[PDB]
Each structure stands twice: as structure tokens, then as C-alpha cells.
Amino acid sequence: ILPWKWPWWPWRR
């Protein structure tokens, strides 16, 4: 599944 190195954490935007 997708890795875990994505940037800009995903918040309740």
C-alpha cells in the first residue's frame, strides 16, 4: 500500500 514518507501532514483542512 502507499508508503509513509509523504510531506505536509494531512490535517482537517
Curated annotation (Swiss-Prot):
Record-listed Arginine amide modification sites: R13
Source organism per UniProt: Bos taurus (Bovine)
Compartment annotation: Secreted
Superkingdom per UniProt: Eukaryota
Protein name, per record: Cathelicidin-4
Tissues of expression: Large granules of neutrophils.
Family: Belongs to the cathelicidin family.
Originating gene: CATHL4
Record PTM text: Elastase might be responsible for its maturation.
Function: Potent microbicidal activity; active against S.aureus and E.coli.
